[PDB]
């Protein structure tokens, strides 16, 4: 009977909540009397967060990644028949990225042809965006000289300040995994590697489980030994895809729906 089930459990919940409240109040009183009991309880009780329940060289940097020996040269382009949103995103990308020369797709220059021309033109990395709807849906980076290509899926995008003329400071976090550290190194190399201390500009790439957040802020150190910050620029996420070793050859990761079934083991 629906009425019987609803009524019986309604009373049970009230009694259980009242008992829990009384027990918690008595425990708080006893802890106030004896603070050590709180420490003893905490030493055995854990919030069991998702992060807490994780389920478990030199030539590489100089070969497959850019360095400060020579200034990077990055080629920026959009997909064929790109809409205004692609150009709007490229406007932000050129400002964020260093030495970006925007180019228009010519509808027939093959990826091999593009790579050959870039070798002729001496271009370090090629960044090509993806656009199905009137919003940016994908972002790709490739290190042209024998380097790999990283395909990123852009999900969120929205646009309280104006960036200054000083180069932002690059900071990375949560890249312990070998797959993660590769993406972190790629982001560090693609972004400028000569930040200006003056201007107090910070650019951060943060990832918690698997999504990497691109955020920019302006920070000032306060007298309380704590630093505040304010929103500065856009905010969007990215998700690596297929981690191809070559220009478009062997795929390394190929994140497919097979993953995310375990609900853990984030890469």
């Amino acid at each position: 009977n629906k009425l019987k089930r609803q009524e019986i459990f309604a009373d049970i919940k009230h009694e259980k909540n009242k008992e829990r409240h009384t027990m918690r109040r008595k425990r708080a009183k006893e802890e106030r009397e004896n603070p050590e009991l709180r420490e003893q309880r905490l030493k055995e009780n854990v919030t069991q967060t998702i992060e807490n329940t994780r389920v478990y060289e030199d030539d590489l940097m100089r070969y497959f990644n850019s360095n400060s020996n020579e200034p990077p040269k990055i080629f920026l382009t959009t997909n064929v028949n790109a809409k205004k949103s692609a150009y709007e995103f490229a406007n932000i990308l050129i400002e964020i990225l260093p030495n970006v020369t925007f180019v228009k797709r010519k509808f027939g220059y093959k990826l091999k042809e593009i790579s050959d021309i870039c070798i002729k033109r001496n271009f370090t990395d090629i960044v090509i965006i993806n656009e199905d709807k009137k919003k940016v849906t994908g972002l790709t980076f490739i290190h042209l000289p024998e380097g790999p290509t990283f395909y990123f899926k852009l999900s969120s995008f929205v646009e309280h300040g104006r960036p200054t003329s000083h180069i932002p400071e690059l900071i990375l976090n949560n890249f312990q995994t070998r797959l993660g550290q590769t993406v972190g190194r790629l982001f560090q190399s693609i972004l400028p590697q000569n930040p200006d201390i003056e201007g107090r500009q910070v650019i951060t790439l943060h990832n918690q489980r698997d999504y990497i957040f691109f955020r920019r802020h302006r920070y000032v150190f306060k007298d309380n030994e704590r630093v505040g910050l304010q929103e500065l620029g856009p905010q969007f996420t990215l998700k690596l895809k297929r981690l191809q070793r070559g220009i478009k050859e062997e795929t390394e990761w190929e994140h497919k729906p097979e993953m995310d079934k375990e609900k853990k083991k984030f890469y």
Binding site: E57, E250, T251, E254
Partner: protein
């Protein structure tokens, strides 16, 4: 079991000594007894091909156009013995990038097209080995009584050369191919100072769209001569090859130049490579060089790995027998090999060394190495107490 792992990121040989069931991914599972790198030379001179001459010696062919002879010694560090590797002699200057660079145009991608070794196996006790390169330069290296490698002679081939498989089913003929290069049978003189082409493959008729079928053989495996009477002039040889366009071309010189039956392994011409020969019952039915010891294609079971993440098993008719490591492999399988006819070595960009049971298709070992794997050889399969 004892295995040697070739690392490209570190350019060193890593030895794996672990028993069946080892899994470094999970702590609760058994862990490898010992693992360490040996003969580190960097990414520039990573090992390309490997071969175990004996239990105490081996020969390597690095990507720097150098073939080295490595001495193997065993000593104690349970209470197991680790392996120490030392170099006795080597031969360098075996690569020619000029021939391949001119072919960069008209290729598919990666204009660099860096030269690299494609095969390293004895010609046969003989102390002679064959070192082929993608540039079409075939070099014969012999281990003389002085114990120093010497290049007996050098031979040229129509570059690019994706593979070079020798013939050993007696019951000096080898087949080589490459991008837009038809399979050709070449005979080497006993003196090894010259070669002779005797047979070439012919492309199949056009496809539905009246377009020439792309030709790009990647690997080959010889079989025993076809039975029955043989026609005058035509040679008696059978070999099956795997093309990059997912075409299981089967060739029979007795029948004719054209393949007698071509079957599409996968739709949309999915990339394929790393051909192998195995048996469903896990038996050593393959010769020392891997050639199938049979005179019929109906008993041919092969393992081919696609470029993205998968490893495929196919029969003689192209039917798929099932994937290998579908739930464990998360990257391209750069190199695979069947050891002793039952063990299946696996590796690739996933940076994991896997041993699979051919009969049950069950994973046995999983060891993390960090660097990408391009060649795996199992010195022995003896367990350690």
């Amino acid at each position: 079991m004892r295995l040697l792992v070739s690392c490209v990121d570190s350019g060193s040989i890593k030895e794996v000594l672990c028993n069946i069931g080892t899994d470094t991914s999970v702590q609760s599972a058994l862990q490898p007894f010992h693992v360490a790198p040996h003969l580190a030379e960097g990414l520039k001179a990573y090992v390309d091909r490997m071969w175990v001459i004996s239990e105490d010696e081996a020969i390597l062919a690095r990507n720097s156009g150098v073939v080295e002879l490595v001495k193997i010694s065993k000593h104690l560090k349970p209470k197991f013995d680790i392996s120490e590797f030392e170099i006795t002699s080597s031969v360098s200057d075996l690569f020619d990038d000029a021939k391949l660079e001119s072919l960069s145009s008209k290729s598919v991608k990666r204009t660099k097209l860096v030269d690299g070794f494609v095969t390293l196996c004895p010609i046969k006790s003989n102390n002679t080995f064959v070192a082929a390169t993608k540039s079409g330069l075939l070099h014969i290296i012999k281990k003389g009584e002085d114990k120093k490698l010497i290049k007996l002679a050098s031979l040229g081939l129509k570059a690019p050369v994706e593979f070079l498989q020798l013939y050993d089913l007696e019951d000096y003929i080898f087949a080589y191919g490459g991008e837009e290069n038809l399979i050709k049978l070449v005979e080497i003189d006993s003196s090894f100072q010259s070669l002779k082409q005797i047979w070439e493959a012919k492309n199949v008729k056009n496809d539905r769209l009246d377009m020439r079928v792309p030709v790009w053989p990647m690997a080959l495996r010889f079989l025993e001569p076809s039975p029955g009477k043989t026609e005058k002039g035509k040679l008696n040889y059978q070999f099956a090859a795997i093309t990059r366009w997912s075409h299981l071309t089967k060739y029979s010189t007795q029948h004719g130049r054209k393949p007698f039956a071509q079957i599409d392994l996968l739709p949309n011409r999915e990339p394929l490579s790393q051909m192998e020969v195995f048996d469903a019952k896990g038996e050593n039915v393959v010769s020392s060089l891997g050639n199938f010891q049979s005179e019929t294609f109906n008993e041919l079971n092969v393992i081919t790995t696609d470029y993205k993440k998968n490893v495929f098993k196919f029969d003689g008719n192209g039917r798929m027998l099932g994937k290998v490591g579908r739930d464990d492999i998360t990257g391209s399988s750069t190199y695979i090999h069947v050891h002793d006819g039952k063990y299946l070595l696996q590796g690739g960009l996933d940076r994991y060394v896997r041993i699979f049971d051919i009969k049950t298709n069950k994973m046995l070992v999983k060891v993390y190495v960090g660097s990408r794997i391009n060649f795996i050889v199992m010195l022995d399969d003896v367990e350690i107490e």
